[PDB]
Design a protein around this ligand. Structure first.
Ligand SMILES: Cc1cc2nc3c(=O)[nH]c(=O)nc-3n(C[C@H](O)[C@H](O)[C@H](O)COP(=O)(O)OP(=O)(O)OC[C@H]3O[C@@H](n4cnc5c(N)ncnc54)[C@H](O)[C@@H]3O)c2cc1C
Ligand SMILES: Cc1cc2nc3c(=O)[nH]c(=O)nc-3n(C[C@H](O)[C@H](O)[C@H](O)COP(=O)(O)OP(=O)(O)OC[C@H]3O[C@@H](n4cnc5c(N)ncnc54)[C@H](O)[C@@H]3O)c2cc1C
Ligand SMILES: Cc1cc2nc3c(=O)[nH]c(=O)nc-3n(C[C@H](O)[C@H](O)[C@H](O)COP(=O)(O)OP(=O)(O)OC[C@H]3O[C@@H](n4cnc5c(N)ncnc54)[C@H](O)[C@@H]3O)c2cc1C
Ligand SMILES: Cc1cc2nc3c(=O)[nH]c(=O)nc-3n(C[C@H](O)[C@H](O)[C@H](O)COP(=O)(O)OP(=O)(O)OC[C@H]3O[C@@H](n4cnc5c(N)ncnc54)[C@H](O)[C@@H]3O)c2cc1C
Ligand SMILES: NC(=O)c1ccc[n+]([C@@H]2O[C@H](COP(=O)([O-])OP(=O)(O)OC[C@H]3O[C@@H](n4cnc5c(N)ncnc54)[C@H](OP(=O)(O)O)[C@@H]3O)[C@@H](O)[C@H]2O)c1
Ligand SMILES: NC(=O)c1ccc[n+]([C@@H]2O[C@H](COP(=O)([O-])OP(=O)(O)OC[C@H]3O[C@@H](n4cnc5c(N)ncnc54)[C@H](OP(=O)(O)O)[C@@H]3O)[C@@H](O)[C@H]2O)c1
Lengths: 428, 428, 428, 428
């Protein structure tokens, strides 16, 4: 019977930020649902000492309002860790601490409900009402709302040729769940040279002398490339660039986004460099039983005895080769999967030439501007669509759109670079 | 006229400015703050381009007490369109010039913070238990009445008596920038004092030594141009833990301890030490640099000559005196607390220690009433972080809590992994 | 009448290194010629403080033989800079010191002749000897030799449409000759986003407050990207990778080189970050009169009243635009131009399908293996062909080839990575 | 047997090893070296994986004297296929395990460097002007005669008197790796000493604390866990300039000066201090770490209890003593010079100062004939760099020049920008 203004579907950092930023707005009735038991930010792939790769300003609220109660600094103040964090004097939060922080913020918000799987959404055009059915442990529930905000995140990619070997092939995302088993194996092969694979490789490399596994690491990319966090390149993480990229033609958007892996993927440079320093240190007396191979794409898997035969394609020599491995860790990246709850309103969503969800500038995905998208469409808003540092930018625009006024005024120019000439400098 | 303030702040440096920022939210308290300068100014005469604070930006006016407060540096950054850029810059250290803009911004918002206001005299009325504070402003003298004083008159450059009276030739490092243009035309410049002040002037003048004709001399009495020890295990001394520990030691041990801690808060920022050497290396490539640097050298006498000063130095290593000629002498000998003249009529109401110094209670009051509180007084009583901008919020919280008689701003008790004393039970 | 074993054409760092490495080998008779007045390593684009981008081990000899008299370390020892260089504790030599280093070495070798322009080479098919004709101020030298080593380096790129404007368009290579005029202009435009452009941008941005120029910097690259010097990418600077790249198909070689701009071009990361910090600092009080545009390619210059009209294509928006500018600095990179002296023996040199000089693995470019190439064939030996870190490698192979002996034995594997599988794992 | 040596080196740590490397190309000198250990070993018992030297690699056996020398670390790297790898690693600090292999490799080249050779006794024959050196070897007792002696017997762990006689429970930091496996099974470990040895054991044990059940206690009597000051202006004290300055001072001043300089060559390396804090921060995220760190605490009593030690410390801040229980105690109290027993028969030929210490001449000889030289003796005589590996070549050059009577390895007189004394003409 109560009509919500917003239902958030999924509570990752982005919708959690939205809860924190709408909490102070008494005008808005909001509710949020997440299927997990409690907040968890990728803790299956979270070795001790792992950090976010961007500064702590990219918390749930501070880019929109440093005064908000759920800033990371206030969390630190309230948990007797503020002085300690600044003695540590790193801009990068420990991923475990970031988990504790978001858990704390999620726990303060009564309208944020975990153990809540959104299974179905329907729309009543006469009342402009979405009905959201949620499976909760005590049973199914119904809420109605004017606006939806989708924040269902992304999930590991598993190629179809890699399915059906649950005992031997696992995703990087579940690494800590299996590391104990991994340490007893004769051979471990990581596929994918991004940050996930790099952290797993460093973690296994650190312990390689205490066990008897061979440690292989392969990526199809032309090298184990570093993420380019050069500051002039960081200006692309900006309202400036977001707005510029969204204005671009659709094919141009795909080309540009295709060239930008080094802006937000790859390996953190200092981490790259720690891997090398560890290789140097452990090869002092005898060679390390480890192999690293760029330009190699896994394209086949077959069982044989009690190991896998992994077939790769070396793009440089254009040949295929086989390595044997007892376990295969896929660190192949994450992808957006459409939530099944959207199925009955699919005809309410706009789609582009290529059948992807089409976004408006303000992150709505329908003509009525009542369905908004968290972390959807790097092809539409650019490579910072998954960047925690642009989460406040997006939530502020969502909030401003829904309430129809500048609740959180958003910056328009923070970059010294210009990504286009003024309309008056163009030559006919 | 008949209005009675809870607090009068005398002086508005960062410490009393922070106190005004942290009390403004408290509508119980009626507070007012007076400063003699034309406007807020934080040592802008010794503020070369690119110069920074030596502690992280968390050490702003309010954030260690309350990260939600409206006058945090991050909120300043947000309201001035510098928040995204500050974090692309990704330094913990605020440009000294930006810290000046930030404080002037805070001061301008607080209508009870009055500059052009010299506090000439303080009297006490034992019948009413009220201080009357006489203030000289451009339009004349005014009187205000208050229950509590908070003394925030800061520190001033040390100019020994033998260096006074040579205005054209001897200047304080505090006024470097007003005299830099004249300096560049001289044939010899001698900087005395090897702290951060002297170092920045040395680097600045060395940086342009090739475009002029000055010999550049730099001498310190310290046993070497030592660096400030900001080792994180030493930073735990910047903490409630250590302030409380130090305060509890006896007076003579406190003088011993503080006399041993020059490296914890004075000396030169390490990376700045290193930039100086690198510049020496770079500029000595083709020919010697006309510069001299001499440790273990104390300025001993100053004799006027024809067109220069004869500077006598005592070298303590060889226990001999020597003379240098210099056209101008830049005094970078450090800063000292001078008891303001307004306090004279109430001196017999203030507590003094066994060495004739103002004595402070744990809560920073200097009388039995606990109605007069001291900002940046008593390095010998609360330790070397008494002038530390990072402990300003801790002191302000305790003052505010004392005056209101409750924990408005609750204060940390242990933040250090180290213990500075065993437990009662472990003592033999 | 005397028959040399080696004539070196051009004495840049690579042939200078070959002189230093063949000098201890009395079985070789060698001579080198260079047209400049003395050794000069790009001193026209060498702002004070600028450094090499690779560690000092990439000197003239040390990768082949650290004992050699012409190591950088020995240079520093003999010049009372060894202790100082290691207090400075940077791996990167100042460019001005590297110049002094190479000048020092070139001056010790009497068989290294400057003011010597190699004008013509002919080949005696019967005696298997080359006749080299050298123009010198006092006349012409004719020497006979069994082998040639070409080390004529590379030169700045000037597009045809930028030619014919000697007053208003200059190369970045001549920056320091023109800086004084530049500082007087109303507008300065730098085209090219590599290290050359960046250092000029930084150098002019540093002084922008003292003059009245607008400072524009544009590149056609998708961003002002950083050079990827991650240690796992540095492993591509190796015999391992050089041999691997050399073996690849011709078109694969061009594809790979096309994708590797970040391995050896773009901007030094520490240097990109200093640029941003300077922009941050200098915009504190007012906006900087500077513009930076990626994705912009200069494609026309037109003369006007007292300035140039510069038309650019912005590839993101697929439109062209015009800026006005009094001076235009070309920082578009360097290119190999084949020396005129080779014209008579062109028929001796091997060419590939694109009409480029075709190199054998041992860096010879003819079937006799008597003409060797320094810094030719990025399309054949890969992106490290101009890498000072690989000069001793190539020189050892050139020396070993000419003598038919392992005089300087060369490493076959220094990398943890493998760029190809073992022969036995290949799948048919 | 009757062969008359020019030099007998007693002890072969790095300093006499470098002397062997520097004298080996001088055929005028007949030298022999004896060391009592089974082979060269540089503190391998306190050599955790990844531990490094704290000064740059230029401070190898020979390179400050002669970068061309065959025994340079760079030459070592090249011949062991680690030169390229070392410079990709791009750290100035050699892993202590690698430096160990380097010194082992150098010692293996020198047929005149004999291990398993304890110099038992030294006599002097006035009639022959020869020292007889009696050496205990596995085979028997070897005698050799020699004109000069160079004492290089190093330093040994400090063990207070009240800490002797508890072999199963108290061990030196020097033997940490012999006992680490036992340590990990204990309930309580206590490290006394806050220097680099203490820090490395502390960090090593802290890293593994979660997988075990020890409480980990660390205490130093220093007023904080101070960092070693390696500011480059302080690095200039590691120089011939300062050694000559320090040597020239009077004896009491030398003791005073050396007393003030702990931060210059002791303490903890700054980056290591900061890693310890970062690890403490990381491992306290969920539960408090079972560890204690106490400065200002001097161990002054050990007391056997049943299953553990009662450790009594004096907290000098509060001037009280307290007891901690500990199953094991690790002494990281530093190292001392002990006079070798073999010098006893020639004690009356050695010069002694007014305090009973070995008195050194400027050229490092300790007798009037200038035929007995001292490695790593006389910190009170030649200053804090007497044990500094970066000054080994300087001392060795001066020893070799003295014995040969000419400037064989010329020695720098001034490397420092600073002056530690005025010119004679300036003195009053
Ligand atoms: C290991 C890792 C580290 C990363 N580190 C960084 C970083 O340092 N900086 C940065 O800018 N980016 C980083 N990213 C990228 C990005 O920030 C993360 O992917 C982030 O978790 C995405 O945020 P979110 O709110 O979109 O989705 P998520 O954090 O994925 O959360 C979405 C949640 O919605 C829930 N959900 C899905 N469907 C339903 C449903 N039908 N009903 C109810 N709930 C549902 C799921 O439980 C899911 O957990 C990282 C990504 C990974 C994988
Ligand atoms: C150049 C410099 C840089 C420093 N940098 C740092 C740093 O990076 N980190 C750190 O922790 N510490 C730093 N310090 C130390 C310390 O923080 C400063 O000295 C700081 O300014 C002290 O603040 P304050 O409120 O005590 O006094 P101040 O900032 O000195 O302010 C005192 C004010 O009181 C006014 N006043 C005095 N008497 C009267 C009166 N009778 N009536 C009215 N007004 C009066 C004066 O006009 C003055 O403006 C620095 C000090 C200096 C000099
Ligand atoms: C500004 C700049 C900085 C660079 N920095 C680095 C770096 O830090 N690290 C790195 O690995 N690479 C660097 N490079 C790339 C490369 O190392 C340089 O281009 C290097 O100068 C090339 O060396 P060289 O021996 O090929 O040719 P050069 O240094 O170009 O020298 C060739 C010489 O041959 C002479 N010559 C030409 N023709 C004749 C003739 N017919 N007769 C006689 N003499 C002739 C010329 O006078 C010329 O000086 C840099 C390049 C530039 C332009
Ligand atoms: C753990 C540790 C790390 C250090 N790291 C550094 C550093 O990074 N940088 C730096 O500048 N300094 C460092 N030092 C200080 C100094 O360099 C070392 O103490 C160094 O080992 C001293 O060198 P040495 O040649 O004097 O003596 P040692 O290395 O002690 O060698 C002494 C040798 O003499 C032998 N010997 C003794 N008596 C006899 C005898 N009667 N007959 C035969 N042989 C005998 C011993 O067996 C021993 O091998 C370190 C010290 C320690 C303890
Ligand atoms: N030791 C040092 O610090 C130092 C100093 C200077 C140079 N170097 C080295 O010397 C080499 C050359 O450096 P460089 O900066 O002179 O050349 P560069 O690295 O090739 O940079 C030139 C840039 O200008 C772009 N460009 C070319 N034509 C253009 C056009 N019409 N319009 C707009 N942009 C255009 C290029 O685009 P593309 O990316 O598409 O080619 C490229 O990005 C580099 O490897 C460099 O590292 C080193
Ligand atoms: N390359 C490396 O990484 C490395 C590793 C180990 C050692 N070293 C070098 O070797 C030298 C010795 O280092 P070290 O750490 O073994 O010893 P150290 O530097 O001399 O420090 C030992 C510490 O224990 C303190 N101490 C002495 N007696 C004590 C007592 N009864 N109770 C409590 N504390 C006591 C000492 O206090 P005081 O300060 O009052 O004397 C000192 O701080 C140093 O120069 C070091 O730099 C280098």
């Amino acid at each position: 019977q109560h009509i919500y203004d917003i239902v958030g579907i999924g509570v990752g950092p982005f919708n959690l930020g939205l809860a924190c930023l709408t909490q102070p707005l008494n005008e808005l009735s909001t509710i949020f649902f997440d299927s997990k038991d409690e907040f968890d930010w990728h803790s299956g792939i979270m070795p001790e000492g792992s950090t976010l790769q961007i500064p702590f300003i990219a918390d749930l609220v501070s880019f929109a309002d440093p005064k908000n109660n759920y800033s990371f600094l206030n969390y630190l103040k309230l948990h007797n860790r503020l002085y300690q964090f600044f003695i540590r004097e790193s801009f990068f939060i420990l991923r475990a601490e970031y988990n504790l922080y978001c858990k704390w913020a999620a726990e303060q918000l009564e309208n944020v409900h975990f153990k809540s799987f959104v299974e179905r959404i329907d729309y009543d055009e006469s009342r402009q009402l979405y009905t959201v059915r949620v499976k909760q442990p005590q049973g199914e529930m119904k809420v109605v709302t004017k606006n939806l905000v989708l924040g269902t995140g992304t999930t590991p990619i598993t190629p179809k040729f890699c399915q059906g070997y649950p005992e031997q092939i696992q995703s990087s995302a579940d690494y800590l769940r299996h590391k104990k088993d991994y340490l007893t194996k004769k051979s471990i092969t990581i596929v994918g040279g991004g940050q996930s694979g790099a952290e797993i490789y460093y973690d296994l490399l650190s312990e390689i002398d205490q066990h008897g596994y061979q440690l292989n690491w392969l990526t199809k990319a032309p090298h184990f490339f570093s993420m380019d966090l050069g500051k002039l390149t960081l200006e692309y993480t900006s309202p400036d660039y977001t707005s510029h990229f969204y204005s671009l033609d659709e094919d141009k958007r795909d080309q540009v986004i295709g060239s930008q892996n080094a802006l937000y993927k790859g390996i953190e440079l200092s981490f790259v460099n720690r891997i090398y320093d560890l290789l140097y240190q452990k090869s002092l007396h005898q060679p390390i039983p480890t192999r690293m191979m760029p330009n190699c794409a896994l394209d086949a898997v077959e069982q044989q005895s009690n190991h896998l035969n992994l077939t790769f394609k070396n793009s440089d020599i254009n040949k295929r080769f086989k390595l044997e491995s007892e376990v295969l860790i896929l660190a192949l990246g994450y992808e957006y999967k459409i939530p099944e709850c959207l199925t009955p309103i699919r005809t309410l969503i706009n789609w582009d030439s290529k059948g992807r969800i089409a976004l408006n500038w303000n992150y709505s995905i329908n003509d009525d501007n009542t369905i908004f998208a968290q972390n959807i469409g790097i092809y539409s808003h650019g490579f910072t669509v998954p960047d925690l540092g642009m989460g406040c930018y997006r939530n502020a625009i969502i909030i401003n759109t829904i309430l129809g006024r500048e609740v959180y005024p958003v910056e328009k120019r923070i970059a010294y670079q210009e990504f286009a000439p003024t309309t008056e400098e163009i030559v006919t």
